[PDB]
Amino acid sequence: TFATPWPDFVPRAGGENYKEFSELLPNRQGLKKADCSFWSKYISSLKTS
Amino acid sequence: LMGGSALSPAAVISHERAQQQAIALAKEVSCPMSSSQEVVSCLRQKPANVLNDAQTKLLAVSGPFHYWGPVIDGHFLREPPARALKRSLWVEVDLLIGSSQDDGLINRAKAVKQFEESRGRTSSKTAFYQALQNSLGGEDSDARVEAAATWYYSLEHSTDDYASFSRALENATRDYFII
Numbered sequence: 001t002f003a004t005p006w007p008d009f010v011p012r013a014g015g016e017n018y019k020e021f022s023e024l025l026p027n028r029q030g031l032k033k034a035d036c037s038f039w040s041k042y043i044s045s046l047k048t049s
Numbered sequence: 050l051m052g053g054s055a056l057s058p059a060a061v062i063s064h065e066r067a068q069q070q071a072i073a074l075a076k077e078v079s080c081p082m083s084s085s086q087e088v089v090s091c092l093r094q095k096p097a098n099v100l101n102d103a104q105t106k107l108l109a110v111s112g113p114f115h116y117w118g119p120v121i122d123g124h125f126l127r128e129p130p131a132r133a134l135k136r137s138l139w140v141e142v143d144l145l146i147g148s149s150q151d152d153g154l155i156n157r158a159k160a161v162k163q164f165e166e167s168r169g170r171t172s173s174k175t176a177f178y179q180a181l182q183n184s185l186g187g188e189d190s191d192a193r194v195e196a197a198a199t200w201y202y203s204l205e206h207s208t209d210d211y212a213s214f215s216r217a218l219e220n221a222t223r224d225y226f227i228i
């Protein structure tokens with residue numbers, strides 16, 4: 001009962017939660033999932049092929 | 050111009066494809082393959098139903114580059130249009146252009162599926178999407194563009210369901226053949 005309850009990083013689709021250090025401390029869900037699919041899934045097929 | 054262009058990558062099929070597409074036609078019905086004057090001299094006397102049978106057997110696969118379409122001819126088209134759109138200036142005609150959101154090449158092949166459902170060919174749908182995915186890159190089907198664009202529309206789930214794979218394929222073709 002001091003702030004919002006932090007949820008743990010569930011390594012799965014529909015999860016991957018984190019905490020945004022703003023005034024309300026909200027629970028977001030998925031950081032840079034557009035851009036961390038770019039460097040991790042696009043280029044990882046371009047670099048090996 | 051409604052839902053179409055003079056720059057869309059099926060508006061001018063080439064001699065590599067158009068000569069192949071009639072060679073592909075003469076294999077369907079029992080027509081002789083000798084030369085140009087013999088792949089027409091059977092088809093100049095075929096009944097108009099069995100020749101439109103051989104369109105549905107052939108257009109249900111192989112995708113948009115294997116559509117029938119215009120060919121560059123020296124008295125009608127001096128150049129492919131991407132260069133030829135700059136080769137034609139000082140002519141005045143206003144343009145009101147525009148597509149729909151519903152214009153998909155699955156949707157333009159809605160009547161193609163109906164005869165394929167009539168005789169019954171469930172393999173003429175999963176072979177149609179990959180042949181559409183084969184055409185999704187360049188006209189030569191370069192893997193460097195086909196693997197690049199299949200990431201961007203995120204359709205690498207042709208495994209269990211045709212829910213997201215059939216929709217996001219229509220997303221991809223419409224933003225390169227239409228819009």
Ligand SMILES: *[C@@H]1O[C@H](CO)[C@@H](O)[C@H](O)[C@H]1NC(C)=O
Nearest residue numbers: 202213214216217218219220
């Ligand atoms: C196709 O495009 C629309 C555009 O509004 C988008 O909402 C939709 O999610 C796209 N389809 C897929 C399967 O991503």
